[PDB]
Amino acid sequence: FFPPLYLGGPEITTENCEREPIHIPGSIQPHGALLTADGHSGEVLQMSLNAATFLGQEPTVLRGQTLAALLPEQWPALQAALPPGCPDALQYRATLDWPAAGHLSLTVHRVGELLILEFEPTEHALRNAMFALESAPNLRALAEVATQTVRELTGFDRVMLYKFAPDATGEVIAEARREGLHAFLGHRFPASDIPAQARALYTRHLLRLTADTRAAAVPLDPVLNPQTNAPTPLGGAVLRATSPMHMQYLRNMGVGSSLSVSVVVGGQLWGLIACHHQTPYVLPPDLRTTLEYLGRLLSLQVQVKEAADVAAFRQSLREHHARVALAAAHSLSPHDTLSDPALDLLGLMRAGGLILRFEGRWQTLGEVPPAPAVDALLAWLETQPGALVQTDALGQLWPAGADLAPSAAGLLAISVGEGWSECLVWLRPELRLEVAWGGPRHSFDTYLEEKRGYAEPWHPGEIEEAQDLRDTLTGALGERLSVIRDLNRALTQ
Amino acid sequence: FFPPLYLGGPEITTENCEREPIHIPGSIQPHGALLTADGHSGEVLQMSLNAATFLGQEPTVLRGQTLAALLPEQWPALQAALPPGCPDALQYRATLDWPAAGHLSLTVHRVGELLILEFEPTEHALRNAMFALESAPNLRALAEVATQTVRELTGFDRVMLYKFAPDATGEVIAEARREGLHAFLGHRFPASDIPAQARALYTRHLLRLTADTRAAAVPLDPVLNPQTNAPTPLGGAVLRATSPMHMQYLRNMGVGSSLSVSVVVGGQLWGLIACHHQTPYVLPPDLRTTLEYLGRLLSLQVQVKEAADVAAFRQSLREHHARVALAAAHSLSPHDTLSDPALDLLGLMRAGGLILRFEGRWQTLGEVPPAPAVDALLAWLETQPGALVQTDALGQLWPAGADLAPSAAGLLAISVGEGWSECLVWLRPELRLEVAWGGPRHSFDTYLEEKRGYAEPWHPGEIEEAQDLRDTLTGALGERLSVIRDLNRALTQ
Ligand SMILES: *C/C=C1/C(=C/c2[nH]c(/C=C3[NH+]=C(/C=C4\NC(=O)C(C=C)=C4C)C(C)=C\3CCC(=O)O)c(CCC(=O)O)c2C)NC(=O)[C@H]1C
Ligand SMILES: *C/C=C1/C(=C/c2[nH]c(/C=C3[NH+]=C(/C=C4\NC(=O)C(C=C)=C4C)C(C)=C\3CCC(=O)O)c(CCC(=O)O)c2C)NC(=O)[C@H]1C
């Protein structure tokens, strides 16, 4: 939301780390060379300071060197594989045999009218992992398999699988770690470590790299593009050096190289596969392609595994679910058909309390707060626009919800019909649970915070069951209105 | 549903082709050798007739040869990578350097307590295609890209992308074909070509092969497994020879080699990637892995592309959709709020007629059949159990629906609430459209059948819009019942 740091950016503090433009840093890592040329002219417009040393040509010779002579054979392939107007996610990787360096790696992605050239040095078990990931019984089983496969392929010290909760909080679900280092498995980190701007950037560009955290980046001369005199968009460039403050934060943990692979499910960021190395370690591209393959495989397989796990969790509860669905879809008066203990809707969701608000009057079951608190909760629920309200913490959402915590801390509510006039409420008592939070900060050890007023997190199977119950109750709403309209007509005339 | 052909199977006719067990044919292709051994003992139980020639050992020596001596180093990996009880989809591929053949391909998948060994001979653009598939603007654009990539990788004569309609009918959406052969693009084939048993088998095993249609298969001695004296499940074996009648059917078209890659979306078969070759052409495994990679990439990318295409189709219609959603969610009397031409719900779905059945009385718009036909259609809709009924053909579904075809051939109906008491009906006039059907049969030329009494197929965006409209109307049903209950109470007392 601000101009770039090198050309009019505000001073970077902890609070405004979300305002720092990381996609346009104006610098690249020193492990490769970057060239920028027009996609229609073929003349290099922007170059890196290390480009002259990397290519072996003098900087004066580099200026004005046409890409046709620069790339004797890759130019027709560059035009054919990258027509103008393609999305920035389209990358073309070709192995150009530069005589000075022998075999060299070339990767090009087009942003607007500019062609960005990325130059990097370059020189069977993947199918077994391909089949192993697809045979994971559950999501948790898949995590260690994927992390171990990544560690075997790369050799990184701490191969960690990063998972993001819906509230933009990250938790570690797996860790392939070399013996000796402290295990970070189970730690949950806040949203401050990964800004929302990264999440916006992370879904479009899945793989990144950091050759060395102690290596100083090099600038691009000229800094601004000659075409538009604007900051150069370097978001899609792997050679782009990450944020210097993030570099220092990584240095605080003594990490030389840090690679992260994004996992995108249904167009939204699901998690990361972070890797750390004590010593700097450049990565050949032919296995970075393998890492991208693994990332896509993981993104597909986590969806499949969540579907299977939801089906299995629902499998435990057909008798309760089928019984309540049969006993609620054909109920003319749900008050007398849902409040009986025979159905036992309280135990279906494993909740301490339940509110039956139908026909205006509300009937409560189990552990419920005093009546004025019930009316306050009902009014607050009516203020909620969403049809289904799910929360494991009424204390944070409701301004003084800690008072209800002795009776109910977590809440799952479904609104029959719409407008919250007729709603079902599930009340979950508070459970004192502590989750370790990691610790720019310098503490990266175990730190458990005594955590106030949440309940047991709602399983996705429970949410699916709530959605199904709401759907069937809203379906029975039609028969309810039909019979009440018959009564209206018969009693009016 | 029947015993195997070689040991008590009924004679194979055109009608009972769905009863032929293809997963247990008892024979394999002659391009490789198959060994079957116990997963706990290590002794080969079943072998192929060609196994002795392939391995270079006499059949007497082959019998009783322990896998530990047979595989000096792969046995510990076989046990580690294949624990007992794993699903049949788990395959372990290892390159065993057999001295007789030099480099040999070994692939093992476990079914029950038996270990099936598959032996086959063996000796950078994939990432570019990886990125090309992800950058396809639409599903149709992705099809030619995928087919061309497959043709470039393999070199097959006719690389065809096969797509299955929800009614188990297949249509060709792309074709990468060598110059000279007749293009099969656009042809639609019935469900007889691919039996439902194949569809059940095709979702679990994605890739198959046929080295030569004129090559006679070889049997396994003994035919039955020594462990259970039962037919050997060869469904997961690539070396399994396909159905001989299917071999003859493929021979009718003069195809030497025929490979098909399954596309599975959300656990159900979405389509196939069929390839045909005039001459036999065995396929090295290191590129069959690439083909599997492409199949998984296609399965993910078709989901993404359908989501994007549905979003784009809905993008055209916010004004109509937002206007009707605002004007229907807060309607106390939908009869006077939905029947006005200002909303123009007829043009939103591009339909020739519409029925507004609320409060018992039904109001019709546009081209509608005579009243007795309307009552018959309403009763038939009430007989339908599903909440949403979608069909482009009322002629087939409704026993004498061709009479309504002059007024409406296709129908899209949404039931407000449940029980079809209050429903919305969209009526689509008949359009005379012809789609070529290909032609075991011997005709594989152009054949267009004059096709009776269907309308324009319902776009997925239209179905999503219908679902959203039904959801919002069922939500407004709650306010309807609330106000009518207030009226009931106020007029009763
Ligand atoms: C307020 C801003 C902050 C900040 C900036 C920042 N961080 C990233 C990217 C990452 N942050 C991560 C966080 C962690 N690293 C760890 O080692 C642990 C725990 C052990 C955590 C929670 C991670 C993993 C990344 C991804 C980078 C990688 O590892 O490859 C960015 C995005 C930069 C880019 O994409 O180039 C930014 C701007 N980091 C903070 O900690 C706060 C102060
Ligand atoms: C009533 C049974 C029949 C039958 C049996 C059958 N067919 C398959 C598999 C396939 N059938 C296909 C159909 C076509 N082949 C073509 O060339 C065309 C059109 C140009 C069509 C529509 C295809 C493509 C397959 C997949 C095989 C491949 O190409 O690799 C099976 C399954 C066998 C197995 O999985 O091993 C069976 C039992 N085929 C018929 O045509 C009818 C008479």
Curated annotation (Swiss-Prot), chains A, B:
Q: What is the effect of changing M245A?
A: Binds PCB (in vitro), but difference spectrum is altered
Q: Name one GO biological process term.
A: detection of visible light
Q: What is the effect of changing H246A?
A: 100-fold reduction of chromophore-binding activity
The UniProt record lists the PAS domain at: 19-87
Q: Which UniProt keywords apply?
A: ATP-binding, Chromophore, Kinase, Nucleotide-binding, Phosphoprotein, Photoreceptor protein, Receptor, Sensory transduction, Transferase
Enzyme Commission number: 2.7.13.3
Task: Give the consequence of mutating M245C.
Answer: Binds PCB (in vitro), but difference spectrum is altered
Sites where the protein binds a tetrapyrrole: C17
Q: How is it modified after translation?
A: Contains one covalently linked tetrapyrrole chromophore. Lacks the cysteine conserved in plant phytochromes (at the position of Met-245) that binds chromophore. An engineered sequence used for X-ray crystallography forms a thioether link to biliverdin through Cys-17. The natural sequence can bind phycocyanobilin and phytochromobilin in vitro, but the identity of the natural chromophore is unknown.
One term of GO molecular function? phosphorelay sensor kinase activity
Top EC class of this enzyme: transferase
Report domain GAF positions: 138-302
Region (Chromophore binding domain) residue ranges read 88-479
Q: Which family does it belong to?
A: In the N-terminal section; belongs to the phytochrome family.
Q: What role does this protein play? A: Photoreceptor which exists in two forms that are reversibly interconvertible by light: the R form that absorbs maximally in the red region of the spectrum and the FR form that absorbs maximally in the far-red region. Also has a slight blue shift for the far-red maximum. Could also absorb green light. May participate in regulating pigment synthesis like the carotenoid deinoxanthin which could protect the bacterium from intense visible light.
Protein name per UniProt: Bacteriophytochrome
Lineage, opening ranks: Bacteria, Thermotogati, Deinococcota, Deinococci, Deinococcales
